Design a protein around this ligand. Structure first.
Ligand code: 5ZN
Ligand code: 5ZN
Lengths: 306, 306
C-alpha cells in the first residue's frame, strides 16, 4: 500500500553526466557513445544572451575552446556541430557506461524523471509532468542547464528533456534531445511568457483510482454522467477535455476497482462543483494531476526494470 | 507587385522521392544518403490498423519484405529499424542527388511547402501553415502518405513534415522527420479529433502590411492601441494573443511602410468589430493568416536561393 511521487532509478543516467566548459561558462552535458550533448547557449557570453547569432558564435570557436570533464578524466574534443538548439561535441573516447537508449519527444500530460546536476555531478532526482503549456514545474538553480529528463522502459533509457532555461514565472523550459524546444520558446534571455496552463484531467482520474485502491472512498457516489456532460463542466474549471482514448487508457484501473470511468467522472464533477470540504485524498487537499494512468499501474501493480 | 500563395521550388526534393512497398501496401519514401524514411504504418495490414503493435509487426519482417523503387531502379534493402513513428530503411546505394539538408521541427504559425506525391512520383506543390492545433489544411488523396514538407534556406533543404494520415474533419496530421507527431495524435486508424483552431494574429498583420505595400490602404486609420487593449479584443474573436516578440518580428515591415505595428493593430481591431463591408484585401474577402512576416518580406523584397 501507499502512494508516493516516485522517480525512476537514476543509476544508468548518472554515468552519462559530464561537465562542459566553454570560456567562463560551465554547464552539464550528456555523454553517450562518443558524443556529448549540451545546450548551445554554452557558447554565449553576457554580450550575446539578449540576441545571440549562434552560427557566427560557433564558427569563431575551435575544438580546444571546449573543456569536457567526466569527473577527473578530461575528454578530448575532436569535433563539434550544432543540431537545432543542442551542441554536439564529438570526443575521442566512447562512454563505456553508455546504456541502451533512445531519443523520444513526449506529449503534454506525460511524466518523466529529472536528474538535476551541477558541474557534471548528480544532485537529486524528482518526478514531474510536461504541462499543457509545454513548461515543467521543476526545481533548478544556477548551473543546472544540461540536466536531462528520462523514462526507463525495460532496460532502455528514453531521453525526453534537456534543461535550457527558467522563465520569469519560475517555471522551466527546454528541448528534446534533437534540440527542438518544447513550446514556443527560444534560447535567448528575453522576456518570454508561457500560455495559460490547464489541469490534466485523465491524470486526475488516474489519481482518484489510486486513492480507491489505497482505501480513500469518501468521494465516490452512485451517479453516472456522459462524456459530453462531464466535458461541459470540465471546460468551466480549466480542465482538459476527456476523450474516448482517455477512457480506454483508464481501462485497467476501472477493471481493478470495478468502478466505471464515467462513474468516476461523476465523482470528479462533484469535487469540482463543491470542493473537498476540508477532507483529503491520498494526503492532499488539492486534486493532483501529475500521475499518468501508467504511473498508477506501475506503483499499484509493481513493475520493475532491468 | 502582386502577392501569391508561393511555394518553394521543389527540384531538390523531387530527386529524393521513392516508392516503398511492403506487402500489398505502397506509399512514398524519402531517400537521403543511403537511408529511406517512410511512415511506419506501411507495415500494417487491414487487421492491424485499429490497434497496431509495431514492435511485433516489425520483428516479423525481413529486409526482403520491403520493395523500394526509385523510378525504374530498384533499391536493395540491407537493413531496417524504427525511430518513433518513422521507419528507416538502409539501402545499398546512396542517393547521388542528396542535397544539403537538415531535420527541423517547426512551430505553429510557421509555413512550409508540401510536395504531394503518389507512387513515389511528385504530383504538385503547395504552401500551407502549421495550425495552432498542430494540424495542417492540406490536399491529399489515397496514396499520399510519406509526402514531405520543407523549407529552403540558402542551399539547404530543411525537412519539417512527413504526412501520415487524414483526420475525420478532413485536416491532416503527421510527424517531423525524427518520427515525432505534431500534436496529440497517434498512428492508429481510430477516431481522433483536433483541438479548436485559432487565427494566427502575427500572420494576419504581416498580410495587412503586404496589402499596404501593394496599394490596398482603405482599412487604415489614424488610431493607435496598446498591446493589452488589442489582445483583449483578439481573445474574443479566437485570435492568438500578440507578444512583444511578434511586434519585433514585424519591424522590417513597419519600417518599409512607415506604419507602426500598434497602428496596424488598431486597423485590425476595427476589421474584427465591423467586418470588411463587402470590400476585399489583396483579392480576399477574409483575413488571411497563412503568410508569415518572413514570407511577406521574401515576396515583397525578392530573396532567391542557391
Ligand atoms: O544566450 C542564451 C542564454 C544564456 C544563458 C542562459 N542561462 C544559463 C544560466 N542559467 C541557469 O543556470 C539557471 N538558473 C536558474 O535560476 N534556473 C534555471 O532553471 C537555470 C539561466 C539560463 C539562458 C540562455 Cl537562453
Ligand atoms: O495502421 C495505421 C494506419 C494505416 C493506414 C493509414 N492510412 C494510409 C492510407 N491513407 C491515405 O493514403 C490517405 N488518404 C486520404 O484520403 N487522405 C490522406 O491524407 C491520406 C489513409 C491513412 C493510416 C494509419 Cl494511422
Amino acid at each position: 500500500s501507499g502512494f508516493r511521487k516516485m522517480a525512476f532509478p537514476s543509476g544508468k543516467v548518472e554515468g552519462c553526466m559530464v561537465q562542459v566548459t566553454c570560456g567562463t561558462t560551465t554547464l552539464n552535458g550528456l555523454w553517450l557513445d562518443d558524443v556529448v550533448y549540451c545546450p548551445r547557449h554554452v557558447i554565449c557570453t553576457s554580450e550575446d544572451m539578449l540576441n545571440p547569432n549562434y552560427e557566427d558564435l560557433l564558427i569563431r570557436k575551435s575544438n580546444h575552446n571546449f573543456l569536457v570533464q567526466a569527473g577527473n578524466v578530461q575528454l578530448r574534443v575532436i569535433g563539434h556541430s550544432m543540431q537545432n538548439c543542442v551542441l554536439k561535441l564529438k570526443v575521442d573516447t566512447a562512454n563505456p557506461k553508455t546504456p541502451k537508449y533512445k531519443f523520444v519527444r513526449i506529449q503534454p500530460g506525460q511524466t518523466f524523471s529529472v536528474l538535476a546536476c551541477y558541474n557534471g555531478s548528480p544532485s537529486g532526482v524528482y518526478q514531474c509532468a510536461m504541462r499543457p503549456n509545454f513548461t515543467i514545474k521543476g526545481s533548478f538553480l544556477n548551473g543546472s542547464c544540461g540536466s536531462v529528463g528520462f523514462n526507463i522502459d525495460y532496460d532502455c533509457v528514453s531521453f525526453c528533456y534537456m534543461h535550457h532555461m527558467e522563465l520569469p514565472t519560475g517555471v522551466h523550459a527546454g528541448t528534446d534531445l534533437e534540440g527542438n524546444f518544447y513550446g514556443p520558446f527560444v534560447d535567448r534571455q528575453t522576456a518570454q511568457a508561457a500560455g495559460t496552463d490547464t489541469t490534466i484531467t485523465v491524470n486526475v482520474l488516474a489519481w482518484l483510482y489510486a486513492a480507491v485502491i489505497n482505501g480513500d472512498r469518501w468521494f465516490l457516489n452512485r451517479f453516472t454522467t456522459t462524456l459530453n456532460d462531464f466535458n461541459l463542466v470540465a471546460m468551466k474549471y480549466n480542465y482538459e477535455p476527456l476523450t474516448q482514448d482517455h477512457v480506454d487508457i483508464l481501462g485497467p484501473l476501472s477493471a481493478q476497482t470495478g468502478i466505471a470511468v464515467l462513474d468516476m467522472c461523476a465523482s470528479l464533477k462533484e469535487l469540482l462543483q463543491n470542493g473537498m470540504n476540508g477532507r483529503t485524498i491520498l494526503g492532499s487537499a488539492l486534486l493532483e494531476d501529475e500521475f499518468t494512468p501508467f504511473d498508477v499501474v506501475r506503483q499499484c501493480s509493481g513493475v520493475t526494470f532491468q
